[PDB]
Nucleic acid binder design. Structure first.
Ligand SMILES: [Zn+2]
Lengths: 180, 206, 314, 61, 81
RNA sequence: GGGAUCGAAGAUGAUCAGAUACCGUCGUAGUCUUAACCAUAAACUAUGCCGACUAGGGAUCGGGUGGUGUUUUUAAUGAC
């Protein structure tokens, strides 16, 4: 008769949400027939289901996942894929899980992922059909299950220290195998 | 010294205040801490309008010395200044440049725009920097309208004024034209106001 | 009824039934483009009934009233905010005034959380435009021959001081006084209408001050026709970030950084925006419009340096 | 009109358009109830120069 | 900038400099006459006193030391000497 | 003396496959501490110490002075 999920927005994401608020609720209320409100008392959004006009149990999860992706920092038009498609997932980890490194070693490592003008990150998102965000030490990868793994195993080798040139060559191999 | 008839009159003072020329805004350079009278509590600074008058007459006496008037160039890239300099060049004999300056106009003869000015007057020393720089290659002196944020390289006479408001830009060019025509014989007496209205110099948007 | 020829704005037409309004007026009018444009399929049915009753009449104002009104709206300065459609409503309303009263002598000639639900959705969308869907918001207050119901403060502002009649369509009473918000430059003290995106412009159009426009509480009276700002008597000024080091274009340092390749069209030796009419500024405002349209159909920038410019960024 | 094109029927109009001047100056105090609205520091400036003007003072505080 | 009078600095600019960097050095402390609320006996106190100065007539205390100027007690009255 | 974890050496599993080509299991010394030794490092800002002058702005950490300033409260103090 009633079920709901409450989810919280961290402060640096708060302003982007306000600026986009009029864009995100029409897709939820129309296409999913959920009901929603922004509860500024506790810097959270709440999604609520009415049993009288809703289609199937999957609606409520899709809505939460869509909002959840936004607070991680994905673009709005990247998050919206979670309403449309059905098999997308998010993976996340932090560089201290791979290798313990601390000072300027830490800063250089994430610089090595982005590359100059972001061109190295952009490359990885093309050879594997996925989206990537770097939020200081934490990495989040959004995509299909097998594509995620292909992305992970190459971002890992950068933080282990391999030169960028060697990694571009590997991306060429993976891309041709997808063609087969 | 110039006789007492050149003192700042109360009628002209009303014009300068009504146009907000005394509002110097913020981000004061370290030079041009003179010309500042005081600061408001909200942080805008008041330009000493009395010194604005003194310098404007001095600039007029420099322009009046030039042997023939087409050797004076007035420049404004910014759009709020364009009609003003066009009118200035019509009442005086000066030559206007409005819009794009095209680099290599004082250097590089064999250019359609090539000129040999005797004096250059600039409306904004930051935006018109190309014209100022090129003048320094060829021994040309420079007069500039300057706000309290303006850089100071290669400007020889600064006139301190609000350089942003549409009315402020127009009013200052108007007063210069009046003073040069009146140091020349073109206006018969300093005591009688000029028939041209200031509004003829203002920018007109629609 | 209390009024002859009550004109309904688009917002009144959507949010209420005709059975609500039938107590108010003997006749009703609307600009045809307004009635044609509105789309809500829940409203359309109620609207269609009232239109087939013939009591709701669609009338277009004459060109003379449009021009006559337009000149007045420029004097107040609201002409830059009012849309073409909004002007038609003002011209329609007070050209019927010329028909139902002799002459013009009544008017002045010149100046002086909450749950969103699929039922509520259309109202919430209108609220996010800033229009008053509730009616009587901030209301503080030849007989009744015309009245206007509208929910847009920009139209209301013009109506009051021209001594027009405004109808509180939520209640059926005429409005004499209202309070709302407008912009005021604290440098030159001039007042400006609040733009429909709901935040200040970067530059004062009068004095050219940068960032000096503050939103200010304002009240308007039909009685006086004057405009009064309301000031917080214990205001503390913040001056963080007013003064900072900035590069000079003619320094020897700048000429070295400029390089040997002439003008680089990528990363274009960026120059800061500091003037309203700087050509760099012209690009960003039009490009902002373009990116807005592209992104919205496919889915279907800041200037100055801010307050913290003087704190180092790693 | 279009860029890069000109003809007499423009040139004749432009010289007419830009001769416009209003009947009463925008700087005339008649538009401002006959007074100048100024801050305290501005009126201090006037006194320092001498002169005498129809000022009106806002505190600003 | 290039030309300025180093021998006749303005009084306002001189007042804001550090005490060792004025054209000639000098202190900026001073002395006070102080009276307790009870007795008539005046006494002289240094404005940056480090000791807890008592009255002479009795062990009532006039000031307490701090990191800078001394804090005069409540009820005392003083005159800059 | 202590001995959880990880783990030079050592004992073992697979030897197939070019992105994931170096991987899995157990484990001695060591990693911690007390009393004595040793005196090396990309021990790096790859810039010897002391003193004077040529230069300006607002951010931050510690101390001090002034303000008819805000808040805690009817002062002092604290925070701004
Ligand atoms: Zn302003």
């Amino acid at each position: 008769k009633f079920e709901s999920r409450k989810i919280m927005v961290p402060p640096h994401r708060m302003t982007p949400l306000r600026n986009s608020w009029t864009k995100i609720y029409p897709p939820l209320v129309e296409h999913l027939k959920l009901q929603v409100r922004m509860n500024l008392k506790t810097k959270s959004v709440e999604l609520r289901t009415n049993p009288k006009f809703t289609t199937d149990p999957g609606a409520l999860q899709k809505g939460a996942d869509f909002i959840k992706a936004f607070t991680l920092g994905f673009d709005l038009d990247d998050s919206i894929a979670l309403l449309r498609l059905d098999d997308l997932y998010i993976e996340t980890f932090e560089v201290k899980d791979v290798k313990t490194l601390t000072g300027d070693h830490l800063s250089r490592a994430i610089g090595r992922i982005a590359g100059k003008d972001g061109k190295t990150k952009f490359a990885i998102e093309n050879a594997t059909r996925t989206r990537i965000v770097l939020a200081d030490s934490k990495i989040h990868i959004l995509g299909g299950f097998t594509h995620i793994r292909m992305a992970r195993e190459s971002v890992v080798s950068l933080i282990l220290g391999s030169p960028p040139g060697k990694v571009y060559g590997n991306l060429r191999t993976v891309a041709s195998r997808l063609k087969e | 010294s110039l006789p007492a008839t050149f003192d700042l009159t109360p009628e002209d003072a009303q014009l300068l205040l009504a146009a907000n020329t005394h509002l110097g805004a913020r981000n004061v350079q370290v030079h041009q801490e003179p010309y500042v009278f005081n600061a408001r509590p909200d942080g805008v600074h008041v330009i000493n309008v009395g010194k604005t008058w003194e310098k404007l007459v001095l600039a007029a006496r420099i322009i009046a010395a030039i042997p023939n008037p087409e050797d004076v160039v007035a420049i404004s890239s910014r759009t709020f200044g364009q009609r003003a300099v066009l009118k200035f060049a019509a009442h005086t004999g000066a030559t206007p440049i409005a819009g794009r300056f095209t680099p290599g106009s004082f250097t590089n003869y064999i250019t359609r725009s090539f000129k040999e000015p005797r004096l250059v007057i600039v409306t904004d020393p930051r935006s018109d920097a190309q014209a100022i720089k090129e003048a320094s290659y060829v021994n040309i002196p420079v007069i500039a309208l300057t706000d309290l944020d303006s850089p100071s390289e290669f400007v020889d006479v600064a006139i301190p004024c609000n350089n942003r408001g549409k009315h402020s830009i127009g009013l200052i060019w108007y007063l210069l034209a009046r003073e040069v025509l009146r140091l020349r014989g073109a206006l018969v007496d300093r005591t009688q106001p000029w028939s041209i209205m200031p509004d003829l110099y203002f920018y007109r948007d629609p | 009824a209390h009024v002859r020829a009550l004109i309904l704005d688009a917002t009144p037409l959507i949010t209420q039934s005709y059975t609500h309004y039938q107590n108010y007026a003997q006749s009703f009018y609307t600009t045809p483009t307004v009635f044609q444009e509105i789309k809500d399929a829940q409203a359309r049915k109620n609207l269609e009934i009232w239109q087939s009753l013939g009591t709701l009449k669609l009338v277009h104002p004459s060109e003379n009233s449009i021009a006559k009104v337009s000149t007045f709206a420029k004097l107040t300065g609201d002409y830059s905010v009012l849309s073409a459609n909004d002007l038609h409503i003002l011209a329609l309303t007070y050209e019927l005034e010329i028909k139902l009263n002799n002459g013009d002598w009544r008017l002045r000639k010149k100046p002086g959380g909450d749950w969103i639900t699929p039922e509520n959705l259309t109202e919430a969308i209108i609220k996010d435009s800033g229009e008053d869907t509730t009616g009587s918001l901030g209301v503080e207050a030849p007989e009744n021959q015309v009245a206007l119901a509208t929910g847009d403060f920009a139209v209301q502002n013009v109506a009051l001081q021209m001594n027009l009649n405004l109808m509180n369509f939520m209640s059926g009473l005429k409005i004499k006084r209202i309070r709302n918000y407008m912009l005021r430059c604290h440098a030159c003290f001039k007042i400006f209408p609040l733009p429909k995106d709901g935040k200040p412009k970067h530059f004062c159009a009068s004095c050219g001050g940068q960032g000096t426009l503050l939103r200010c509480a304002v009240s308007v009276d039909s009685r006086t026709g004057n405009v009064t700002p309301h000031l917080k008597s214990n205001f503390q000024w913040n001056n963080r970030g007013n003064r900072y080091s900035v590069a000079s274009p003619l320094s020897k340092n700048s000429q070295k950084r400029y390089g040997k390749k002439g003008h680089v069209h990528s990363k274009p030796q960026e120059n800061v925006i500091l003037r309203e009419d700087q050509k760099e500024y012209e690009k960003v405002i039009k490009q902002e419009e373009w990116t807005r349209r592209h992104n919205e159909k496919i889915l279907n920038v800041r200037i100055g340096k801010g307050r913290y410019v003087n704190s180092s960024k790693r | 009109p279009v860029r890069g094109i000109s003809f007499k029927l423009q040139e004749e109009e432009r010289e007419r358009k830009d001769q416009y001047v209003p009947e009463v100056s925008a700087l005339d105090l008649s538009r401002s109830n006959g007074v100048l609205n100024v801050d305290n520091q501005t009126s201090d400036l006037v006194k320092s120069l001498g002169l005498k003007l129809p000022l009106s003072v806002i505190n600003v505080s | 900038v290039l030309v300025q009078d180093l021998l006749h600095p303005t009084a306002a600019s001189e007042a804001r400099k550090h005490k060792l960097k004025t054209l000639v050095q000098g202190p900026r402390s001073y002395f006070l006459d102080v009276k307790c609320p009870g007795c008539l006996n005046i006494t002289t106190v240094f404005s940056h006193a480090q000791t807890a100065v008592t009255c002479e007539s009795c062990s009532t205390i006039l000031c307490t030391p701090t990191g800078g100027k001394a804090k005069l007690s409540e009820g005392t009255s003083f005159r800059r000497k």
